[PDB]
Amino acid sequence: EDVKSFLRRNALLLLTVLAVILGVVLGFLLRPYPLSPREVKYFAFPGELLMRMLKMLILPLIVSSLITGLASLDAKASGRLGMRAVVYYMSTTIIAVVLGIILVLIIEVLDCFLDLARNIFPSNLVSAAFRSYSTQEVEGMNILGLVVFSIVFGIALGKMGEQGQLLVDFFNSLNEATMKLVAIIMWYAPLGILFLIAGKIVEGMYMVTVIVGLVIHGLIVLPLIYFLITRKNPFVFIAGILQALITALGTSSSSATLPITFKCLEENNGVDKRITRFVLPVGATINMDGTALYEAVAAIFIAQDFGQIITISITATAASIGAAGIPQAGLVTMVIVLTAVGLPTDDITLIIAVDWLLDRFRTMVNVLGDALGAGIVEHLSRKELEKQD
Numbered sequence: 001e002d003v004k005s006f007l008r009r010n011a012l013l014l015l016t017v018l019a020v021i022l023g024v025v026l027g028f029l030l031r032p033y034p035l036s037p038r039e040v041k042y043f044a045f046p047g048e049l050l051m052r053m054l055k056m057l058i059l060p061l062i063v064s065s066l067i068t069g070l071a072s073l074d075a076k077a078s079g080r081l082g083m084r085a086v087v088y089y090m091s092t093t094i095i096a097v098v099l100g101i102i103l104v105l106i107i108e109v110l111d112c113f114l115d116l117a118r119n120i121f122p123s124n125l126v127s128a129a130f131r132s133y134s135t136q137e138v139e140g141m142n143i144l145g146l147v148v149f150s151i152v153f154g155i156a157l158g159k160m161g162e163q164g165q166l167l168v169d170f171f172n173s174l175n176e177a178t179m180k181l182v183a184i185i186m187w188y189a190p191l192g193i194l195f196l197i198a199g200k201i202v203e204g205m206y207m208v209t210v211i212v213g214l215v216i217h218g219l220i221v222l223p224l225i226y227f228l229i230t231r232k233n234p235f236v237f238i239a240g241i242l243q244a245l246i247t248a249l250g251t252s253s254s255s256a257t258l259p260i261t262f263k264c265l266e267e268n269n270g271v272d273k274r275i276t277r278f279v280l281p282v283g284a285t286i287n288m289d290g291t292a293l294y295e296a297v298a299a300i301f302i303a304q305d306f307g308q309i310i311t312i313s314i315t316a317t318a319a320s321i322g323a324a325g326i327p328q329a330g331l332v333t334m335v336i337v338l339t340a341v342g343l344p345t346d347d348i349t350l351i352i353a354v355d356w357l358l359d360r361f362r363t364m365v366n367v368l369g370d371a372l373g374a375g376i377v378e379h380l381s382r383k384e385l386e387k388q389d
């Protein structure tokens with residue numbers, strides 16, 4: 001009798017779950033039909049509108065969250081909160097790349113660094129909102145440039161007392177208002193996910209290695225870390241951020257699923273806005289546990305000496321940090337890990353075909369790390385938030 005109350009309460013949660021079930025069924029059913037590449041794009045259009053909607057809100061979401069969030073905290077507490085984040089991010093990505101290396105043993109590069117330094121320091125803030133540098137400015141928002149600028153701006157506003165308050169208040173209203181619009185987007189999400197995944201399925205031992213490896217990291221490593229740190233049941237936490245994971249599986253972008261990761265953690269998991277505004281936008285771009293595991297697996301897979309296996313763990317953690325929270329950013333950053341060891345970069349072409357499905361899974365682990373990461377930081381920074389009340 002207690003399942004009718006579950007269906008009433010979890011209406012939206014189960015709808016997107018059904019959207020995956022119906023989407024996989026529809027996609028395989030429509031796959032024998034030849035269609036056209038143009039026709040596939042037409043078919044997947046309801047999934048495209050969901051991407052346009054989510055993408056729309058990331059700019060006001062990142063900028064307003066970091067400016068308010070860092071102004072909300074004292075600069076020394078921001079460093080303490082920050083040290084908790086960076087220490088967590090680096091350990092979890094090192095834990096994943098080591099796990100990744102173990103599983104496989106059982107079964108223009110300078111320009112890349114310069115371009116990244118260039119994006120950390122945008123020469124124009126208006127363009128940074130829709131363009132990124134690529135050696136000379138390719139289309140596509142500079143999330144890293146804005147993340148960095150907002151952090152320095154947020155610290156500055158906190159440091160300027162009351163004169164600062166007006167702009168903190170301005171940006172707080174702008175965050176709550178964009179968060180009110182993601183409530184709307186969420187109802188379209190089941191229709192979008194169905195079409196976004198059905199189109200992608202309308203198109204070996206390696207693919208299984210990552211899939212199993214991400215289950216060990218995602219469902220065993222990360223939860224036991226959260227339990228060991230907070231002493232709270234981690235699988236109930238994962239149930240709250242479920243809509244955010246199912247959307248990561250659909251979009252394959254951790255920057256596009258950030259507004260929904262915000263709605264879940266803030267509400268469903270009841271995490272502090274002060275720390276979600278701090279953790280989640282930074283975690284979206286730099287904390288990529290699932291990508292790190294995939295970088296290591298693929299670098300060793302194409303090879304199919306220990307001091308150069310040491311360079312793989314260093315460059316796979318390096319690529320993990322660099323790679324944008326945008327779909328297919330994984331194999332584009334494989335150039336850094338393939339070059340460092342000495343393997344030919346042209347081998348990336350062998351992976352490309354199956355990569356799409358692995359991307360959806362590694363995005364879920366990249367989001368899951370930020371979700372559990374915020375829960376861990378919130379708990380550790382208990383006193384800092386206690387003081388600001």
Ligand SMILES: COc1ccc([C@@H]2C(C#N)=C(N)OC3=C2C(=O)C[C@@H](c2cccc4ccccc24)C3)cc1
Binds near residue numbers: 080082083
């Ligand atoms: C790759 O890009 C990043 C950017 C940020 C961060 C950390 C983070 C998270 N999560 C957030 N929200 O803020 C700060 C972080 C610090 O560790 C340092 C922290 C900080 C505290 C006090 C004064 C600062 C002055 C300048 C920059 C950061 C400062 C801010 C890590 C990597």
Ligand SMILES: N[C@@H](CC(=O)O)C(=O)O
Binds near residue numbers: 327328
């Ligand atoms: N698409 C992934 C990044 C990657 O492809 O490595 C994400 O946004 O989490």
Ligand code: NA
Binds near residue numbers: 285287320323
């Ligand atoms: Na990254």
